[PDB]
Structure formats: structure tokens, C-alpha cells
Amino acid sequence: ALLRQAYSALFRRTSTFALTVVLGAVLFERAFDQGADAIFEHLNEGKLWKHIKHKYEAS
Amino acid sequence: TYAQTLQNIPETNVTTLDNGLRVASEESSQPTCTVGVWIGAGSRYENEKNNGAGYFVEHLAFKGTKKRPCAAFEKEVESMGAHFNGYTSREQTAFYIKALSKDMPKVVELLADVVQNCALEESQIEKERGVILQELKEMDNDMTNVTFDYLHATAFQGTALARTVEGTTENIKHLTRADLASYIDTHFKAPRMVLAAAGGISHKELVDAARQHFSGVSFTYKEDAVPILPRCRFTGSEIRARDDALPVAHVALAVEGPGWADPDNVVLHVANAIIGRYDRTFGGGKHLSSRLAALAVEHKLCHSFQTFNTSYSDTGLFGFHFVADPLSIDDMMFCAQGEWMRLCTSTTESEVKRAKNHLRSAMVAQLDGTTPVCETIGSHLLNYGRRISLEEWDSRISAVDARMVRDVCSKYIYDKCPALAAVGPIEQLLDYNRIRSGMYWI
Amino acid sequence: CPGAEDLEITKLPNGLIIASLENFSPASRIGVFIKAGSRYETTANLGTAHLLRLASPLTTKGASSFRITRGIEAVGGSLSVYSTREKMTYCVECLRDHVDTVMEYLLNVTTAPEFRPWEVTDLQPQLKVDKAVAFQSPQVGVLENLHAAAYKTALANPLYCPDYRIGKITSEQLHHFVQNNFTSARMALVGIGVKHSDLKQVAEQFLNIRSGAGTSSAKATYWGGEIREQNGHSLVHAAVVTEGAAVGSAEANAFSVLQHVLGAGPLIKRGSSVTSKLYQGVAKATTQPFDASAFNVNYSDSGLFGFYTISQAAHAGEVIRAAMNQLKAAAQGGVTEEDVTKAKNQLKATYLMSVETAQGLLNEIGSEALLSGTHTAPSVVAQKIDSVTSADVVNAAKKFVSGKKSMAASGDLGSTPFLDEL
Amino acid sequence: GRLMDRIRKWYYNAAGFNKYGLMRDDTLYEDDDVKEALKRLPEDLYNERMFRIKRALDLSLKHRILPKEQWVKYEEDKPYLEPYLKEVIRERLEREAWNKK
Amino acid sequence: XXXXXXXXXXXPLLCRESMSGRSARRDLVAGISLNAPASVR
């Protein structure tokens, strides 16, 4: 019963609501960034310096 | 000492008959007494066709019976210096008599005659047609009355509790003798009735006279069975009946209650005692302990405000009602909802130490006389199944602390969609969403 | 564990009466009965009795206006002041425990007010409010006009302060009124749910101030006037009285029985009144809904007796004339020996159930303890009432038809008869 | 030891509000307490206070003072508001204490 | 600690029984209370 279980704990007191938003934004940032980064790099394989890097490191 | 005088109150005796009728009494050394029958019948037991029939019945209860017509019945009751009175609510009907303790058996006979052998003269009904229709026009100018009816009409919208006790105009117009007689036979039945008495009455001689005039045993199990009413749905909603020509505005706001059975109803009464009530004749003025009352005086917020915890069988209505001038409504509602949050959040032990003392003095004041004792007894059995002595009430109340009041209030009030009834010049108070947002965070 | 106790009465050298009674009820109720009221007002200080009872929560010489309200509410207690035209009762209710607590504020209010000029001034406009809400019931309108039309002084004075003197009552007038009337030989400390030895101890080792009998009242001169208020209300209230009997009079009981013979207020909810010859006699004369009861007041040195008719506008004439004829026919002999016994029964009933309540008991005890410093056993008050003959009743009716009448009526008096038309 | 009276009388003259024909309680800053105490003042004392203040104001805009003859003497200064102000404070301290307990 | 209040200003009951009980049984009492609505009889 997530919709209820979330309400009682997270969404009731205005405090835990804010603490949820704060911690939710932390989780969302790690997730969204890694996600969008992956979608973009896969859409452009072999085109980024990320990819063609190895070809020029005889260092 | 107080602690002993509670312990030394004569216990209420209870005995049940063959047909299921309960008889209860509180015997004192009173030369006078009050004895009547409290029936588990009201407008909730009614429906779309027979709405206000039990009220139409209430009009014809004193208008004569089969054994003795109107002329004889009124003459007989008046002659013994006895007062015959009664009422009908949404869930409870009652007919009772105040008389000397000596006339107790004759009284029980008189009571048993009305509930059973009511006349219902076809000519008499036609008179009470216009009588009720006038009482409707007269109650329609009671703004407090109109508001509380509207409150039920929207809080329990779409259910039986949303109906007025008096009923529709169309129903009163067209109700038949058959419809009335049907209500009486359907609802006024022994197991759903309680013969209560209080005064200088021997309980034994009460159940004897009761055993005589409340006779016929039920045959089937069905007639022993007490009906389980269908539940009533609460609705976070509002009804705004606007009339700017109306001098002052009335506003009632409530959340859903717990019901007679719930022990939380005690705490909700302690909480309601904290906020209390006020009207501009309260001599205490700005020095009143009630915060809402103090703010009401300091800022001239309202003519009057009251808090209520109206309980029903399976539900209730915890809320408040106030009367204010067209331009003091919003500030009044503001402070009122603030004190509600103050209940759930900030309630101190000092506050409830007072509130408990007030509620103690209240329940004791509730039993000042024979009729108010009989009313308690006739209702205690009908709702609790037993008598709750003042000694027991005190034990429940004395266990209430600030931490408990906060919890119970946070449970029934905090972040709940309330029911709103507003009548009159009501512009300053507006938007349910604003009222709804006043339900959280002090 | 609790039993049956007697009521005790003590008279201090002060002349102060202490009527106590232990009933072992979990709620105590102490009152201070005083022979004050607007009856002792003159034209110079009209309304000072009204402002006085509103001045109860004001500061005292021992308790602030704050501590009075906060201290009393702290223990669930309550403070109230009931008063008629010639009586003043200061009541307190509370649990048995906090008697002494609430007893302090009660004692402070009645025996040591300060009447601070600014508090008095701030209280003055409450007269407008308190009067306005009481005057919402049309009866208090004609009832105040009745006393004004019935007398010339004392009882002629209004119970609620006249408009022109609102805000014009000095703080010194309050002081003088309390000094002149709240004296020991005019008061009574009456309690319920208290041991007499405690209530007595409180009244002496705490309660004192000015002794003696203080300011007296010019005994009520009769007038016989006719005050009429035209306000267009569809319902017309009307009262017609002559001089009745005083408190503790010989003819006192005779009028009370005649009242129930004629009938005084229905005993059955939404019911017609059969025993009432007045209700019935008028019902034969008029068509529409109405109310017509027997009116009877008993004061210390006088009293009023007659009928009060609430009727429709155009049918006021029918009801009033009919109600008049019922007292004429009652004086001409129309009183059955059974009617008396039936009324003497209704009266003995009404008395008994009135003393059920805490209010009714404390008042009934304190009323008598104030005037005739005793309490009469309820059996003997039952003797004194039914020892009234049938002739005594017809005699009381004779006094009405003979004596000079005074009438007060407010409504749309377009069809309301004048007093010289009855 | 008549020292305290020496010091007070010195400060009263060094203050010099008596040059404006002002009482000591005239120069009182009107906070919440003083405001309340002022409303409790009798009409005559209030109307007199009002004139003394308006006179001091008029003097101040003239950059003049009263003649030495019309200066309020130290021993002739009426503490007309101080008894009122003390009760206003006493009453308030009661409420503040009663609201904690 | 009990009793109902009211509200009016300055500056119906038309049926025989719902406006019954009023015609002055006695005469006129005047009650006012520290914390209870101003009584009138």
C-alpha cells in the first residue's frame, strides 16, 4: 500500500515532506544525469572524444 | 469529598422483558419523577418517501390514543399535574412524562398507550399538515438551525443522515395515515425501546407496571433482531447558501466523528472543552481562558461561536459553528482553524488540566434533575448498551493528558477534508481550497 | 458512606442568614442572596442595579478582573448573577473540591468591589448589548411597560437600564448602591453540597463590611396606567393586571390556585389546554393560533395578577375580551370544587418538580432564608396551599374585576382594545 | 544621609524639562504600558497633560523656553501617571505569570 | 458552563404551540453570567 504508506510517513508533516523533496532531489539528480548522459552518448557512438580517445594515446 | 460522592451514587438498575424491552431506573428520594420511553428511531431510519414521518408521528403522539381520545387524554394528563413532552432526532426518538412518584404506574400505562395504541385520527392528521408546515417556516428563520441542517446535507451528502428530521414540504403535504401507521409499526418495537425512569421510584414496581402494559412477546427471531443501518459516507465538501440581505452570517465547519462506541469521543470532548464557546454576553470578556474566545473579544471576530462533537451510531461530526458580521468572517475562520491546529500541535498539560475540570463539571451539570437523568439513562442504554456512571466517566476523563489530545486531534482533524456549511452574507469567507489549506501546519 | 442530612440555619449577630444543606451531590452550588435591585433606584441613579450585575467580573479589592475569570475557569467553575426588580443572587457552581477556591472570588465580588472608573466606563456599552438581546423576546417589552403602568415608584422602575442613562452611570453610584444595600441584615449565604460548619466559618471569618439595614425603599404606590407600543409586529402581546397579593400574604396562595384554575401554560407539548378555562374560553372566541395564560407576581410589599395574551393583530380584540370574560365568569361563581382541587394538585406538582434542579433548590431555600429566616418543610407548604377554599378562589377573581386595572400591550395595536373598553 | 535627595534634585534640574513646563511623567516615552495607563487618566488630568505637551512642542519649534518663574519646581512636580502605570505593569506581570503556569 | 447564546443589534413564531410556553408564568428575571449566555425569564 505505497500510496498510503508514503502519505503517513513522508507527505503528512510538512517537515518530512521537505526532507523527502530534498532527499528525492539527491536521488533524482544521480539517476537523471547518468540516464540522460547514456542516452546522448549512445545516440552518438564513435563520434565523441570519449570514444575516439584511445586512437591517440601512445603515451 | 468529591471522590467519595461519585462512588456513592445509586447504581442504575437494568432488567429486560420477554419481548426485549429494557427497563432502567435511577432511584432517589424525589417526590417527583421523570419516566418515559427512548426509542431507537429517527430520520436516518426514514427514507425518500417517508421522510419526516417520525416527526409527523411526534405531532400525533399527544393528540389522543385508541383507549382515550384527544379530549380525555389531555384532560387526564393535565389533572395529575403531569407534564408530557418528547422529541425526535436523526437517530433517536423519545416520549417522557414528569409527574409525582406516586403516579408512576399510571404514567407507564399512559406511555405504553401512546407508543402502541396511537389514534391517528384522519381528521387530526389534516390539521397537523398546516401545523408542521408552519413550524417549517418558523424554523427556517433560525439561522443556526438552517446551517446545521445544511451541514448534515453536505457532510453526509447522498445518505440517510443528509435528511432533515422534519422532512420535505412535499412529504409533509402528502404523507398518509397508512404511511404514519407504517412508521410506528416498523420502528416503535420493544427491543429498540428503553423504558427509563428517575426519581422516587422503586425499580421493582417499575418493571412490574412495565411488564403489565408492555405485553406481547415477539414470535420470530426477526422481531428480536435489531437492524444494522447502512453506513453513511462523509464528503469533504461545502454548501454555500448566500443571502446578503441576511443581517449576520452563519458558518459551520466539521470533520467526521468516531461514533458513540469509540473511547476517543472522550478525548474529543476534552479537546472541545479547551476551545470552548462564547457569545457577546460572556462577562469574562478578554480575560477568558479560551484562546479563540480571547481573540474573538480582542478583535471583535464574532457574535458567538460554539464547538460540537455530535456523535451518531457509526459516525459523528466534530467541528465548530460561529455567527459573525459580513466583514469579520475570514478573520474569525482564520483564528478558529488556527486553534484547531493548536490542538493537534501545541496543546499543553496546563490547558487540559482546565478542560478536564470543565468537562467534569459539565457531565455532572448534565444530570441536574429527573428528566436529564432519565434522558442520559434512556440514551446510555440505547447507544452504549449500559449505564456509564459519573464515576466511570471521571476515570476515562482523568486519564486524558496533553499528549493524548494532540494525537486524537491529529487523527481526526489534521490534513482532513472538512465539511463546510455557510449561510448569509458570506463574501469575506471564500474558496474551499483556502479552508482546506487551513487544515495543516499551525 | 452518605445518608440523609438536615438543612441548617444560623443567624449571626450581623443579622446575616446562613442556610446550608448537605446533599452529597458531586457538585456544590453556593449563592449570596441580597435584597437589592432596581426597586431601590430613584430618578437620579436609574440603571445602577443593571450595571451592577454586569460589573461582577470587574476588579475587586482582593482579586483582579483577570484572576476572577481565570481562577474560576481553572477549576471548571462558573459565576453568574441573577436578579429581579427587588432581589439579587450571586451564584457559583463547581466541584466539591474547589469550593473554597471559587468561594474566594464570590466573596470578593459581593463584599469588596472597586468599580475602577476605566473598567466601569469600558463596561457601560455592554448595557446596550445585554438589553438588546433580552429585548429580543417581546414579553420583556410589555412586562417592563406593565410595571411602569402599574406603579409610580420602586417596582415602577425598569429591570433593564433605560437608554438615556447608558454610559452615564458613575463609578461612585455603583459604590453607593453596594454600600447602601449590600448590608449584612439584607443578605444570606446559602449553600448546597457543603457542610454547615464550613459555610458558617466562611461567612464570619471572611465576610463582613457594612452592617445594619441601610437604604430602604419607598413602598410601591399603585397607579393604574395604560402603556401602548405601536411597532407593527403581526403579533400583539398584551397584559392586564390589578394589584395582587404580596409575598407571605394570606391571599397569596388563593391567587396561585386561581392561576391554575384559569390555567398557566400548557403541560403537554403541542397540546391544547383542557384544564385551562382561560385557554379554552378564548379558543371559542377566536379562530387562529394564540396564547393566553394567567399572570401572577408576588413582591415584598405588593403584587400583580391578571392575564397575558399573545394573539394575532386583528384578533387581539377577540382574545383580550374573551380572556376578560373568563375572569368575570370565574368571579361570578364559575368555579367547581373539583377545579380547585385539580388546580391545587397542579400547583403542588409544579412546586415540587421545580425544586428538582440545583438552581431551583438553592433559590427556594435562599428566597425564604432571606425574607423569613427559616425554611418551611415541604409537607407544610403542601398544607398551606390546599387549605385554600373554593370561596378563596372566587374571592381572588372578584378582586380582579373590582380593582383598578393597568394594561401593557406592544404590537400592531390597530385592533387592540383600550382599558376603558373592558 | 540626605544624599539621594541631593542627587535626584540635581538631575531634575540638569534634565531641564521643567524649563518647558513639563512634568516628569510628561516626558515618559509611550510604550504599550504608558499608552494603557494614559487611557485610564481622569479627563481633567489628561486635558491638562495635553496642553503642557502641546505647549512644550510650540516652545520647541520656537527654540524658546518658559520664563524662570514658570519652571516646574522639583518639589512641585506631580507624578500624576506613575500610580496608574505601576498597576498597569502589575496587572500585566500577573497575566504573563498566569499564562506560563 | 451550560446554556445557549444569541446575537443581535441596535443603534417568526406564528403557530399556537411552537410559540407556546411564553406568556410569563411568573414575570421577569434577569440573569447575566461570567461564562454563560445572558439569561432572561
Swiss-Prot record, chain E:
Highest taxon listed in the record's lineage: Eukaryota
Binding partners and assembly: Component of the ubiquinol-cytochrome c oxidoreductase (cytochrome b-c1 complex, complex III, CIII). Subunit 9 corresponds to the mitochondrial targeting sequence (MTS) of Rieske protein UQCRFS1. It is retained after processing and incorporated inside complex III, where it remains bound to the complex and localizes between the 2 core subunits UQCRC1/QCR1 and UQCRC2/QCR2.
Protein purpose: Component of the ubiquinol-cytochrome c oxidoreductase (cytochrome b-c1 complex, complex III, CIII). UQCRFS1 undergoes proteolytic processing once it is incorporated in the complex III dimer. One of the fragments, called subunit 9, corresponds to its mitochondrial targeting sequence (MTS). The proteolytic processing is necessary for the correct insertion of UQCRFS1 in the complex III dimer, but the persistence of UQCRFS1-derived fragments may prevent newly imported UQCRFS1 to be processed and assembled into complex III and is detrimental for the complex III structure and function.
Protein's recorded name: Cytochrome b-c1 complex subunit 9
Species per Swiss-Prot/TrEMBL record: Gallus gallus
Gene coding for it: UQCRFS1
Shown part of the complete sequence: 31 to 75 of 272
